[PDB]
Structure formats: C-alpha cells, structure tokens
Amino acid sequence: YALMVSNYLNWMVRNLADMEIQLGAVKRIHALLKTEAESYEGLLAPSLIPKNWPDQGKIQIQNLSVRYDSSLKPVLKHVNALISPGQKIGICGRTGSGKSSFSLAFFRMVDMFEGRIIIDGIDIAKLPLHTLRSRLSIILQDPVLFSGTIRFNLDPEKKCSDSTLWEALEIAQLKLVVKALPGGLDAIITEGGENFSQGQRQLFCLARAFVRKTSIFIMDEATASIDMATENILQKVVMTAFADRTVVTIAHRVHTILSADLVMVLKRGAILEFDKPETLLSQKDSVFASFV
C-alpha cells in the first residue's frame, strides 16, 4: 500500500483540479436560478373577467409611461392617449419613441408600466401575459422566418386545422410559393425561409390574424421590402381596419401612415405632438421635413 500512496496521491490532486471546473459549472447555473422576474400569470382571474376576444381595442391610459431601467430614465413620459375603437390609428414617428413605448405597453412587454392600461375594458395588469399578445398581432422590421412544417408554422400556437389561412396567405402574396413545395400543408420550411420574399413573414401574420382571430395588429417599418410590399401592407391594414376594427401602424415614413384615422408621434421621450385627423399633421411641414 505504501508504494501505491505516491501513485494515488497524484490521481487525487488531478481530480481535485478537475472538480474545480465542476465547481464553477454549477456557478453558471446557480446565478441563473438566483434571480426570478416577470412571472407569466394574471393579477387575479385573468381568464374570464376580461373579454373572450377583444375586437374594438379601445385603450384608456392616463399618465402612462413605459420603464425598464428600474423605473429610472424611462423612454416614455406620461403618455395619456385614448385609442379610437373601430378604426386603425397610424402612429408615425421618426424614432422609436412613438413605436417602442406604445408597443411595450400593448403587449405588456414593459418591465414597469407607470400608469394604467385598459384594453377593450380589461386592464393590462389583470390580463394574461400570453393572451395580451395572442390577440395583438405584431411584425418586426426585418423578415423573420422559422424552420419547420407549414402546419406547425402558419398556426404554431393555435394549431388550427383550418385551411383558409393557407389560401388567404397565398391569395395575399406568394401564391406560387406553396405550389413549389410538394408537401403543401405539411411542407417543411426550406432552411427557415432562407430564400423567400421579405413580406412573406409579414404575410404569415396576416394568415395568422385570420386564423388566430388576433384583432389587434401592430405594424413596423420594413428596412428591406419590395415596391409592392408597401401596397400589400396598406391592403392588409385596410382589411384589419375594416374587419378587426383595430390596428396600430408604426413606421418612420409619414407618407406610409398618412392615410390613417389618427396620427401620433413621440419626441424627446414624451408626447411632442399628436394629430387627431390625418391632414392636421400635413399642415405642419416639420413632420414632412423630418421624414424626408
């Protein structure tokens, strides 16, 4: 045994250094589980007290601001605007203050909501986190395409079996795209939409709106898009305004959101000037000059 003492002494020290990697391995996990925030639950019974499926999308916000940096230096400052039910309001702003601050409150994406927000008579605080955005369709700036089957991508969350969304998506644009894939309904995404139209991702939201019954729609400016993509965006907004009777358009182009029921803009982290009609902002040349 004495002869083995030296041999095993090296082995014990060798493993002790190796266990240090294991000791640090749990450190990366312990820190992750140390802090918990943004629980996905309603305040009290957020399943039946609110509307089953809001359609008008009326917003009653009084001195409402969006804060994320521990309620210090928030990007919004007491935004108190009443939405117009039955119409689509296009809030056009050069910066994201009009868009990002408003979007976060609508989907409860703001860590701190310095105010009270009510959607179709239902408060955001007492509403489900998933249902807040489930009925509030939204799109990003650049196209985003996932990888998987069409039936698992067109209606991923809803898992609806209706084939009208596929026809509606094809009717809007990229009708021949479906015919290219032999699978059709079960066709998988070609490398997550590596080679497809930029507006196809936006067109996916339109099909989801007709499938998931997401009345509220959120629009974002497209960094890259075709000339006809803007026309499709205007057509989709008109369909959402006519049918869903609720849509929020956010873009950096004044002309794109010019044909809107209401025009809003935020500057310097607060509400600089908002126009109830569409031609009220057209009277002032400052808005047009800033856009172009």
- Residues 268 and 150: their CA atoms lie apart, in Å, by 43
Q: What is the token pair recorded at 271? A: 């509400």
Structure's resolution in angstroms: 3.3
Neighbours of 182 (CB within 10 A): 7
Burial of residue 49 (CB within 10 Å: 0-12, 13-18, 19+) is middle
Contact 144, 201 (CB under 8 A): yes
Given 3-state DSSP classes, what are the helix, strand and coil percentages for the chain, each rounded to the nearest 5?
40, 15, 45
- Residues 206 and 74: their CA atoms lie apart, in Å, by 32
Phi, psi of 256 (to 5 degrees): -65, -40
Contact 236, 172 (CB under 8 A): yes
Angle between helices 198-212 and 164-172 (to 10 degrees): 140
Nearest to 94 by CA among 281, 267, 280: 267
In eight-state DSSP terms, residue 187 is: P
Q: Cα dihedral angle (213, 192, 171, 242), rounded to 10 degrees?
A: 30
- Residues 138 and 152: their CA atoms lie apart, in Å, by 19
Helix (H) or strand (E) holding 28: helix 2-34
Sign of CA dihedral 92, 222, 84, 46: negative
